[PDB]
């Protein structure tokens, strides 16, 4: 009937709790579509996933599909202005990104629900007539180069590419997907290749409607969404491109029974075991790979990990199936290594083959499969509502793998137990099919190969036949048993009736010396879940570096100790986070409310009765020492942010201080520390979800009673409940702190223009200014000037104080970056002076939409409340109040704010810059004053005043 529509999908199977409405279709040109109607959504969204990616790059132009992905954003025939797309989104509360994998290129945006058609039309042009403008190409290739650089000294990316480099060099798996300036400009130029031409040729050949899937989510009815999508996408051309397939495994016989020894950048020790396996995707209804991953990767009693951990050889383990491409996959078992584990790799691998032999001996276990199936069913049913942008992106990817009607269920629900497929995969997990990689600094100076794209130093050796034979003869080890039935599975899903005295925001329902309890019964989501958040304050958690180390080690040891017990709860949708903070400890229990009290009670009990295992102690301490050392290998912009935090906060122990004090942490000292820590506490809590006032009070009393019983906890004095202040910068001051990154050959910078204490007015002046410059900052400093891949601007909030920050990572020296940011500020001043009242009000409305955007799930709402609580501002109605004020601001207000606080000649400018030099290290910029160079952070802070702390609302 409608010629542009080939078929309309039958009922799209969805969760019973999901109120969104769905319609699937296939357009005449072969585009698979899902429409999602959600009349409540504040932001609408679209995504399009093309089933082509870097495995299809030309062999002589590594990175082409990725580069194309960048270029699509930079202008189309209908909208040739280079940043039209980004500017429109920014002016309408939207955002966009994309990624390129081996087989997919996935583009997505969100936007104010009133402006879906406008964004979608601009988006659709990417897939119709991109300019691939020559000047944009010559600039944007630097962004891709900078992206690659950032990855060069990253251990994960190094390993990722090294695996590719050690399989069949003729297989597309071997390709370098990112590209860089060499592969996308220099080499093509020397080969007489026209890169713009190649980009157009690639788009023409592969951006075909038959390889595309689109998802659109908006307030509109399904009928209107249907017409909108037909209108904008039926013109995409169908080239009837065959879908690439890779039936030959990149790992052939000569790539098996191989051992690789690799030098990492960080001081890390890891073991990677890999087996090639057939593509299991077509078996998704039974998912034999997930069954085997659940078992091999299990962390409960009887598991492979448990025994490896008891032997003192490894701390963590990931096991299971890993994606390859259509035609090939992998099965992995990866562990970290203790110092002793590094000496026992052959033994560790033996134990892996013993556990696998145990699975073979027992045969496939239907009760295991059924338990997984039933947990998946529960998870699907009570699934949190997703944010639109991520949801559209994810669905567009999976529309390529499942019928329209099954796209929502396909990745949750398991259907048939197929013991024959399980045995088939298990039959692949054999020593004659193994690849082994050991990552360790101990191989430094002992390697003889270098991977070309990253520079990775490694060695390859055949694994001796005698070793393979021993693994082949792996027998049953009495330490390994199948998991026991999961007893944490929830069974009570009753949603309690909303209480008569229920409140819209959290209410303070307990307020004593020991505890302050905030409570809200969920009145939005009505899923059988709750969030239980606790802050335990103690001055002994951060008093000196040694105590900070001890607080960290205590909680790491506690989690390590509880891990076997809590893993089952995890699997059953009940999880917890436990960490030391600068003020004490943070505990959060989340998930199904049914068995929450049981897990929470176990944690508090364990906390208060904790007995440390000496061997776990030494192992965890050694890992922590390396973790502190390894910060040296983090990115320059991460260094910059870290130093600014240290500089601007009243108290903060540095990594160097922490590791100096770490050698001194002994088992006896840690044992003494714990009772001291627990002896006096104040507890502030937020209990939010499917719970009543009475259960909330009962939970808090149980927590208190348990510490009182086992730890003899008593309340802190109110005077002891100190929070830290931010350093108060002098009017017209400019300070610079300079450090070097010894690992990366890029610099980083953060510039911070401190404004004043947070308040309704100061907050909204700053947020509106940030909204206004946000997209222009990126367009100018990255897209035009190409200073680096990482360019960020926005509000910085800490310790009740705030200001504007820029962060850039670049090949250029930080002093150059400073001049360019300063040049940009002047451009923005003029831009704000010239902008129409209409444009200005668009920015106000965009910020308004962002601030009023409703939480889609419980934990998003809890996090808002939690922010108000830990900041001690307690302003739960903030968004309404601050947006109402925002709407009264004028352009003149913003200009005055800029002139008073931010401009280079501003009377109240307060500037601090952190410059992180690389390892080896146009509008007019203004003249800058001479900075005061910070030589010593302690001296810097001593010499300045400290702000007051903000008052509670």
């Amino acid at each position: 009937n409608n010629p542009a529509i080939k078929r309309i999908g039958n009922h799209i199977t969805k969760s019973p709790e999901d109120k969104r409405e769905y319609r699937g279709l296939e357009l005449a040109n072969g585009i698979k579509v899902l429409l999602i109607s959600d009349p409540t959504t504040d932001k609408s969204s679209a995504a399009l996933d093309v089933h082509i990616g870097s495995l299809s790059d030309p062999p002589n132009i590594a990175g082409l599909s990725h580069f194309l992905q960048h270029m699509l954003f930079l202008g189309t025939k209908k909208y040739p202005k280079e940043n039209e797309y980004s500017q429109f989104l920014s002016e309408h509360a939207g955002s966009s990104n994309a990624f390129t994998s081996g087989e997919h290129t996935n583009y997505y945006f969100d936007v104010s629900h009133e402006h879906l058609e406008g964004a979608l039309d601009r988006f659709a042009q990417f897939f119709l007539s991109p300019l691939f403008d020559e000047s944009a190409k010559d600039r944007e290739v630097n962004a891709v180069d900078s992206e690659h650089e950032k990855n060069v000294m990253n251990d994960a990316w190094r390993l990722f590419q090294l695996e590719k480099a050690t399989g069949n060099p003729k297989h597309p798996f071997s390709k370098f997907g990112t590209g860089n300036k060499y592969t996308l400009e220099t080499r093509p130029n020397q080969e007489g290749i026209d890169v713009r031409q190649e980009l157009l040729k690639f788009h023409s050949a592969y951006y075909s409607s038959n390889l595309m899937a689109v998802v659109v989510l908006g307030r509109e009815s399904l009928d209107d969404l249907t017409n909108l999508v037909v209108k904008l996408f039926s013109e995409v051309e169908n080239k009837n491109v065959p879908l690439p397939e890779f039936p030959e495994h990149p790992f052939q016989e000569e790539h098996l029974k191989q051992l690789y020894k690799i030098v990492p950048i960080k001081d890390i020790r890891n073991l990677y075991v890999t087996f090639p396996i057939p593509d299991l995707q077509k078996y998704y209804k039974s998912n034999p790979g997930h069954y085997l991953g659940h078992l091999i990767g299990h962390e409960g009693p009887g598991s492979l990990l448990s025994e490896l951990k008891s032997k003192g050889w490894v701390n963590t383990l990931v096991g299971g199936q890993k994606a390859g491409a259509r035609g090939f996959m992998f099965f992995i078992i990866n562990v970290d290594l203790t110092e002793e584990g590094l000496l026992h790799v052959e033994d560790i691998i033996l134990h892996m083959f013993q556990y696998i032999q145990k699975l073979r001996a027992e045969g496939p276990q239907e009760w295991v499969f059924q338990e997984l199936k039933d947990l998946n069913a529960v998870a699907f049913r009570f699934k949190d509502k997703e944010r639109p942008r991520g949801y559209t992106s994810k669905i567009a990817g999976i529309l390529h793998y499942y019928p329209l009607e099954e796209v929502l269920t396909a990745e949750y629900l398991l259907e048939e137990f197929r013991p024959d497929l399980i045995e088939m995969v298990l039959d692949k997990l054999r020593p004659e099919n193994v690849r082994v990689a050991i990552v360790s600094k101990s191989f430094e100076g002992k390697t003889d190969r270098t991977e070309e794209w990253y520079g990775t130093q490694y060695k390859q050796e055949a694994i001796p036949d005698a070793v393979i034979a021993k693994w082949q003869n792996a027998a049953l080890n009495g330490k390994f048993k199948l998991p026991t039935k999961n007893e944490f599975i929830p069974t009570n899903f009753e949603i309690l009736p909303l209480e008569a005295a229920a409140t819209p925001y959290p209410a303070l329902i307990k307020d004593t010396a020991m505890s302050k309890l905030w409570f809200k019964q969920d009145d939005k989501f009505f899923l059988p879940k709750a969030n239980l958040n606790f802050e335990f304050f103690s001055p002994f958690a951060y008093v000196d570096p040694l105590h900070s180390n001890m607080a960290y080690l205590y909680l790491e040891l506690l989690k390590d100790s509880l891990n076997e017990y809590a893993y089952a709860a995890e699997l059953a949708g009940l999880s917890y986070d436990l960490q030391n903070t600068i003020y004490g400890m943070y505990l959060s229990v989340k998930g199904y409310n049914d068995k929450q009290p049981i897990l929470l009670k176990k944690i508090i009990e364990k906390m208060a009765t904790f007995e440390i295992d000496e061997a776990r102690f030494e192992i965890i301490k050694e890992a922590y020492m390396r973790s502190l050392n390894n910060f040296r290998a983090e990115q320059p912009h991460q260094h910059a942010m870290y130093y600014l935090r240290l500089l601007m906060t009243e108290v903060a122990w540095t990594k160097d201080e922490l590791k100096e004090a770490l050698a001194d942490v002994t088992l006896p000292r840690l044992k003494a520390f714990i009772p001291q820590l627990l002896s006096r506490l104040h507890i502030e809590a937020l209990l939010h979800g499917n719970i009543t006032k009475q259960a909330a009070l009962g939970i808090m009393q149980m927590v208190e009673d348990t510490l009182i019983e086992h730890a003899h906890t008593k309340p802190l004095l109110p005077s002891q409940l100190a929070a830290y202040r931010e350093v108060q910068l002098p009017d017209r001051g400019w300070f610079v702190y300079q450090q070097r990154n010894e690992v990366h050959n890029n610099s980083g910078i953060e510039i911070y223009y401190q404004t004043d204490m947070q308040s309704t007015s100061e907050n909204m002046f700053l947020e509106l200014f940030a909204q206004i410059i946000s997209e222009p900052a990126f367009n100018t400093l990255r897209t035009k000037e190409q200073l680096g891949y990482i360019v960020f601007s926005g509000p910085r909030r800490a310790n009740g104080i705030q200001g504007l920050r820029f962060i850039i990572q670049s090949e250029k020296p930080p002093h150059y970056l400073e001049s360019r940011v300063e040049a940009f500020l002047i451009t923005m001043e003029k831009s704000i002076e010239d902008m129409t009242e209409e444009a200005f009000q668009k920015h106000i409305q965009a910020l308004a939409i962002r601030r009023l955007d409703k939480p889609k799930k419980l934990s998003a709402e809890s996090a808002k409340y939690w922010g108000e609580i830990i900041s001690q501002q307690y302003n739960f109605d903030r968004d309404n109040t601050e947006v109402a004020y925002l709407k009264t601001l004028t352009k003149a207000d913003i200009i005055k704010f800029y002139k008073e606080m931010l401009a280079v000649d501003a009377p109240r400018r307060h500037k601090v810059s952190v410059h992180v030099l690389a390892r080896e290290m146009l509008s007019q910029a203004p003249a800058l004053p001479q900075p005061e160079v910070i030589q010593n952070m302690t001296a810097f802070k001593r010499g300045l005043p400290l702000f007051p702390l903000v008052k509670p609302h």
Binding site: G293, G297, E299, L317, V318, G319, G320, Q321, K322
Partner: peptide, 4 residues
Amino acid sequence: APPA
């Protein structure tokens, strides 16, 4: 853990 299983990978994802």
